[PDB]
Design an enzyme around this catalytic site. Sequence first.
Site, PDB file in Angstrom:
ATOM      1  N   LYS A  44       0.816  -1.214   0.000  1.00 40.28           N
ATOM      2  CA  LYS A  44       0.000   0.000   0.000  1.00 40.28           C
ATOM      3  C   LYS A  44       0.852   1.267   0.000  1.00 40.28           C
ATOM      4  O   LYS A  44       0.411   2.298  -0.513  1.00 40.28           O
ATOM      5  CB  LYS A  44      -0.972   0.034   1.183  1.00 40.28           C
ATOM      6  CG  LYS A  44      -1.928  -1.149   1.279  1.00 40.28           C
ATOM      7  CD  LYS A  44      -2.863  -1.254   0.087  1.00 40.28           C
ATOM      8  CE  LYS A  44      -3.766  -2.475   0.201  1.00 40.28           C
ATOM      9  NZ  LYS A  44      -4.851  -2.437  -0.819  1.00 40.28           N
ATOM     10  N   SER A 232      -4.056 -14.266   5.072  1.00 34.57           N
ATOM     11  CA  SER A 232      -4.043 -14.183   3.609  1.00 34.57           C
ATOM     12  C   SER A 232      -2.676 -14.583   3.024  1.00 34.57           C
ATOM     13  O   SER A 232      -2.606 -15.257   1.988  1.00 34.57           O
ATOM     14  CB  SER A 232      -4.437 -12.780   3.144  1.00 34.57           C
TER      15      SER A 232
END
Lengths: 263, 270
Positions: A44, A232
């Site tokens: 990000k 994840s």
Amino acid sequence: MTIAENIAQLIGGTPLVRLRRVTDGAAADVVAKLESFNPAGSIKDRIGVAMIDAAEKAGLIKPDTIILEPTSGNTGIALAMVSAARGYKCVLTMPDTMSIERRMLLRAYGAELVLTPGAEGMAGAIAKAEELAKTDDRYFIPQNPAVHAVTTAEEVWRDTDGKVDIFVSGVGTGGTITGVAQVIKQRRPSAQFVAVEPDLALVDEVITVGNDDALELARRMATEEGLLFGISSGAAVWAARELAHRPENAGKLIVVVLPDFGE
Amino acid sequence: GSMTIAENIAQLIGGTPLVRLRRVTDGAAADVVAKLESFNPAGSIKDRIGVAMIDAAEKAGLIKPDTIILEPTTGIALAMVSAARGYKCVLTMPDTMSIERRMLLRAYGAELVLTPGAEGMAGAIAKAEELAKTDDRYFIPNPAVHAVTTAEEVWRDTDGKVDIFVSGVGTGGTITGVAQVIKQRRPSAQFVAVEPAGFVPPVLDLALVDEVITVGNDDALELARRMATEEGLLFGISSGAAVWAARELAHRPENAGKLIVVVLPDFGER
Ligand SMILES: [Cl-]
């Protein structure tokens, strides 16, 4: 001399590491790209700095601009950090479901937080931001292959010496997996992109990850590779390991990203 | 024609970057830069100390695969490297340690033996020494090699131009090591220790150390807040003090045009 002007210039250039132990085999090699070496700990960071650069280059951000962004997770941390680095005031809207820890960290970066009600979710956060933008025209709200996907792909390309065979990743928010697939596939049509699940034009397969076969793999990573990441990331590695044992993938080079676009 | 891939994360310790401190220095005739040890996998210079210890023990044959690395507690660094390299790791620590720190260590597969809070680190050092005598599978881990490496990076990245190195002493003379090496090639270079107003503080030989600046503690807090908010660099009170010291040095007229290096997180952080 090698000296960065500020931390926002030290985003990217992340390293590859082999996953030797957790792959229990295996005819294929698996490596992971550690986006955790970014200043704020994820991919990000790249999305954030790219958004600010583009808006500057386009004149949309002036020097007295106030960055305003509804947020729920990491995009927000990256923006706060980059905003502070570059001299921009940063206002952030988020539902009150957000952890105290994330709030404190954002406030440490000089971000001003406007909490919306939990029940309204992100729509509540998007709504408050819309509202505030009308309030004062110094506010700027951020929002083919995206620049940060290009850079990310180039690094994977360089560090695998063009040999990458399968890219394996969570879907994530910012069209990152698809962008990287666009670029790699263009130079290496034989390359495959596999999305991991707990624009499908470019995804060759989707592996729905037996959620919590994921937890097991995350535990092994931490204890057998010294790599601590979330569910994840575990799923991604599980998917990669599955790919790594398919006999038609013998000798192939498989790249996974941690923290995964899902984590 | 070459791939760039580390075997494991223990190979990615070091090679940390320099950044300019442009805004928090409000001036200044001298340049200040910070070496970001936070880019290390476990977030500090302690990573270098941990891996260096395990490498030495391997080279010396003292660390077999039939081992348990035992260490009173740096602890994070060891647990991470141990797990990376395949070594079982046991750690002794006082029960005053945060539940968060404990959970993280356990995530790396470290086994924790809690000593009493009242006894502090001496208790932990004592329990560890006792355990080592209990069972022979246990192994308890100049300028030091990790100080040499750190110096070389500072030397390379500043192109031999570093003039003042500015740092908290911490414990064990990582900081003194780096001074020794820089001063040996650049006798005009200065080293300044920073203080608030072999796990003990080094002796500051004044042959090595040119000054001590006592960081009017919290002054330090102010500068830490400015770093986070004006440079996007989030660190603690000791790092704030170091940067305050560096800024003070940076405004002395006799340092005009000098290049000043600090190391973040500062070796004195808790
Ligand atoms: Cl080929």
